RNA sequence: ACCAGGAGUGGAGCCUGCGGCUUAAUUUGACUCAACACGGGAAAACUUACCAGGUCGAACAUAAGUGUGUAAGACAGAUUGAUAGCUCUUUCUCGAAUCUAUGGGUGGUGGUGCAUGGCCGUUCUUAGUUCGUGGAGUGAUUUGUCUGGUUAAUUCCGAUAACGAACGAGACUCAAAUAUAUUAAAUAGAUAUCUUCAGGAUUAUGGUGCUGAAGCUUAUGUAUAUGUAAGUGGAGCCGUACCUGUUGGUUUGUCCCAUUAUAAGGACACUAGCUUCUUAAAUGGACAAAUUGCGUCUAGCAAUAAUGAGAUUGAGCAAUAACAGGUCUGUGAUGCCCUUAGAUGUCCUGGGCUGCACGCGCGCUACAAUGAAAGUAUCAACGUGUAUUUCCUAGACCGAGAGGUCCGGGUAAACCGCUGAACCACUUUCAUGCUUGGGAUUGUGAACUGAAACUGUUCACGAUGAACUUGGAAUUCCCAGUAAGUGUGAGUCAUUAACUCGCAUUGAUUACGUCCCUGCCCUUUGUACACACC
């Protein structure tokens, strides 16, 4: 659930990536979970670099976050 | 037959609310009271925002404040007859029991 | 009594509760040298822990101060008779809580201008009564017309972090001068580990003590008996 | 139901109850314009109860979802009032009266495996129409 | 009786200021009644620590 | 503060800030930066301090009727805005606070922020202040607080000329990433299977299959459906399991029992649903010998090692001396001055703050082809919500609508609600034509809130389609989940958001610096600098 019409779309992703790496870890073989991760790792599109980026509170004299409206008749 | 007493318990301070599960759930535990463990509830936040100041004249901010009250509930499958004495022992500033009757 | 309130709402109505019961308590017990109140709502019984200085005249002819406590609340909010319980407790360390001792400097300030006997002696007391840091000053009309502001500190005052946000006490107190008025501001700043300090929080912020390193016996000879 | 997207199926559904005389149509169908914001009358009937296919899965995964419940969050992408934009309920009206048309509670209680699977074969024969 | 209009249980007037009778700047709508000039001195004891 | 830019505004429309204008009065505070969508100021009246009509009475000894009514109230007709016996023509009346000329106190959103307090803003996106010992010197005050290195940093090293100086900054406070690895569920449920809601023939077919199956109509009973025959038609029918789906419980599971039914007690899987998840209450958490021709051995950028993690990371807190900054209209903080039965106070009736040839600022509405339309697909979250006041709402119902009626839920992970948000995305309709872009103006009824609406309470319908095609000189903010688009909630609320406080989605160009320019921070430095180049 979450994200939207893009966002939501995205986190498919980091869900089908490491559903064969356990699967492979506990279940049938340590070079299957080696053969699965050499073909992604090289430059890999995110798939497991989640970085933390989200929404930052916001402020005053602005409409966003990081923004302020101004002229006050400088 | 038997009674289902579901009880809540909330506070603002969370070492109380850590204090309440140190002497209250192990002193009914010892005599199978069934407190199907510590139940943490979601807080309720509040936020108020307004002018800081008395005639506001000047790079206009505002103060912010916040407040936050935390739960924790135990329920009990025990009948009337045992939960009496629980509620006499121990009693904490600022904890809240709510126990139902009629 | 019992209402259909909402918890939000029956958290901050208890707010509200206590944010009125200092107020007339100072108007009253200023002479007494009231300080804090500790409330619990109980069950069958609400307990309040007045903490006041000068127990001797917080009680009355035959609880006649006390009995005056009762009924205050009893018909301001219009509770029921006997869940109510008001007890003025004599306060410990009372130069060390010195919120009072700025009360009492409005009983001080009476003697004519006396910053030498007097505002110089409210420094005095508290390093007698042993503050790492306190704090007062004067802000209003003193020699003369225009207003003028002195400060007197003495210690270690950090105005800033959370032990600033812990170490302090607040005092403001609006004393009515011959002429026209004065507010009184006084800080404190207090050693809050060491004596017995059960629960100020008997915390340390950033200081850093390093015990004996323990030096050893390194050869450790047998010298083995065997019992 | 859980086969592909109906942008053409929702268009597919709204012409066979009407092939098979179910249209039961309305009385201002000429001069309504669902809500209060659009400017212009819509071009036929036939999108308007396109919904019963939205409660194949919104009775399924929403509710057993009355008038009210459904019209307001249905239908938004509004342009409202000029200065500024907002959103509104889309005043549903008539269509409240939709279940006539198909004749604790449900709302549609033939489309359980009698109505839907009939248009769950019409997608397993789309099914067969798109094999080519 | 006689010379007293407003039937005030609509709007503002008159159900104002349970902090300092003081009908023009009232924050009223969680529950709070404080009179906001009547809230930084009168913050405590009621909760409401800053933390950001 | 630029550059490299971006979006803008300054043009247009409109809304408000305020002046000016005018008015009975258009209450008023505040003039650079730091007054200018501020006094939360989105005000019909109320607020209100304004204007115009009214209106209340408030102490005391003195004191004099005596209680032959000192008063206090209504009819009645004037006055009224209403009834105001406020007044009064005229009537009975509880009469006593003896309603006093007199002390004087009372009150005020009266005066003054050049009387102050309190509070706040700037000085403050920096890096500085200041004390006990000394040697500097007749003293002012200097030394400390550095020549450098490095730091966001008076941050440390090192020279080291008090140090043991003290704050400041650091440090601590909060916020989603972080093993559920440990207890934890009326959040959520993963699941598992019981199932029920079952298509398909994806399956295997048993009965069956041209013999009339499936399907199709008429008649009327029952209260039109269904039953049947005929009608009817020429291959399928019906049942199962696999596939994919509702539902209900799976809390110490099942069957036990007490129990109306949960648990164990009785056994089994010996777990016939467990805690992933949301929630933490915790420890964990780039926890930095992090490898790098070591820079004045001291802090060699190097991204690179991790693989939740190359800061999870933003605010809050903020000194020293201060300024004639802001406010006495936040206040029963308040000096002084003003007033006090004929009030500025106070309550009523009103108006007005909204008035408009004019200046301006803050924002939204657009100036359309990355669109305006229609549908369709189908996505959040902070929150939010009625006990002594009528909130949140669902469900049916009516209505072009607006809204109206009826039965509910919800004092709330519980109901609203899993809030199934907008812009996008998907077929179209439009042919660029101030145009179906753009919706000012203005009629009209239809609403509805509130006792009450009229430069307006807002909302409906069908009319009306201006100005304006990128906006002169100018000038705003800003380096990532940011700008910006696009929304919701909250705040003022009976109804009134175009602002305000955060929420959430969509997601750039470009910078990864420089010391020109307006800036700013203390090291030498001339000076007539002073109330500090105004």
């Not at chain 1, 995205?10 to 073909?39: N, P």
């Not at chain 3, 609880?63 to 410990?92: C, D, H, P, S």
């Not at chain 5, 349970?18 to 009547?38: E, W």
Request: aromatic share 8%; proline share 4%; net charge positive.
């Amino acid at each position: 659930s979450g994200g939207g019409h893009v966002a939501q779309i995205y986190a498919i992703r980091q869900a089908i990536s490491k559903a064969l790496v356990a699967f492979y870890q506990k279940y049938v073989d340590e070079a299957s979970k080696k053969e699965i991760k050499d073909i992604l790792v090289q430059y890999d599109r995110t798939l497991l670099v989640g970085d933390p980026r989200r929404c930052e509170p916001k402020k005053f004299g602005g409409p966003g976050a990081r923004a302020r409206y101004q002229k006050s008749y400088r | 037959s038997v009674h289902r007493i579901r009880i809540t318990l909330t506070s603002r301070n969370v070492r109380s609310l850590e204090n309440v599960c140190r002497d209250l759930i192990n002193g009914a535990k010892n005599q199978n009271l069934r407190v199907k463990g510590p139940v943490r509830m979601p807080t309720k936040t509040l936020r108020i925002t307004t002018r800081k100041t008395p005639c506001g004249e000047g790079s206009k901010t505002w103060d912010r404040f916040q407040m936050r009250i935390h739960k924790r509930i135990i329920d009990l499958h025990s009948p009337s007859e045992i939960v009496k004495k629980i509620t006499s022992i121990n009693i904490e500033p600022g904890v809240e029991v709510e126990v139902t009757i009629a | 009594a019992n209402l259909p309130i909402s918890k939000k709402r029956k958290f901050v109505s208890d707010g509200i509760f206590k944010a009125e019961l200092n107020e007339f308590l100072t108007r009253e017990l200023a002479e007494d040298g009231y300080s804090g109140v500790e409330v619990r709502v109980t069950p069958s019984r609400t307990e309040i822990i007045i903490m006041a200085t000068k127990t001797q005249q917080v009680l009355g002819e035959k609880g006649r101060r006390i009995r005056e406590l009762t009924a205050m609340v009893q018909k301001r909010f219009n509770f029921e008779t006997g869940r109510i319980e008001l007890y003025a407790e004599k306060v410990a360390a009372r130069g060390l809580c010195a919120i009072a001792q700025a009360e009492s400097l409005r009983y001080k300030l009476t003697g004519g201008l006396a910053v030498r006997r007097a505002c110089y002696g409210v420094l005095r007391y508290i390093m007698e009564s042993g503050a790492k840091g306190c704090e007062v000053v004067v802000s209003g009309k003193l020699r003369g017309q225009r207003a003028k502001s002195m400060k007197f500190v003495d210690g270690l005052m950090i105005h800033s972090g959370d032990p600033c946000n812990d170490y302090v006490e607040t005092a403001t107190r609006h004393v009515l001068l011959r002429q026209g008025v004065l507010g009184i501001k006084v800080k404190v700043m207090l050693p809050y580990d060491p004596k017995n300090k059960i629960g100020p929080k008997k915390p340390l912020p950033d200081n850093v003590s390093v015990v004996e390193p323990k030096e050893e016996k390194i050869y450790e000879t047998p010298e083995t008996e065997y019992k | 139901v859980k086969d592909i997207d109906q942008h053409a199926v929702t268009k597919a559904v709204a012409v066979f109850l009407k092939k098979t005389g179910k249209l039961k149509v309305p009385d201002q169908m000429d001069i309504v314009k669902t809500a209060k914001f659009k400017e212009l009358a819509p071009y036929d009937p036939d999108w308007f109860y396109v919904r019963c296919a939205s409660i194949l899965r919104h009775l399924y995964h929403r509710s057993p979802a009355g008038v009210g419940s459904i019209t307001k969050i249905y239908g938004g992408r509004k342009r409202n009032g000029v200065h500024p934009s907002h959103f509104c309920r889309a005043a549903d009206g008539a269509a409240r009266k939709a279940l006539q048309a198909l004749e604790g509670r449900k709302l549609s209680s033939i489309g359980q495996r009698d109505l839907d699977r009939i248009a769950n074969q019409i997608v397993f024969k789309q099914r067969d129409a798109a094999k080519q | 009786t006689l010379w007293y209009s407003h039937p005030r249980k609509y709007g503002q007037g008159s159900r104002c200021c349970r902090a300092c009778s003081n009908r023009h700047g009232l924050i009223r709508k969680y529950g709070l009644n404080i009179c906001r000039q009547c809230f930084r001195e009168y913050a405590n004891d009621i909760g409401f620590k800053k933390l950001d």
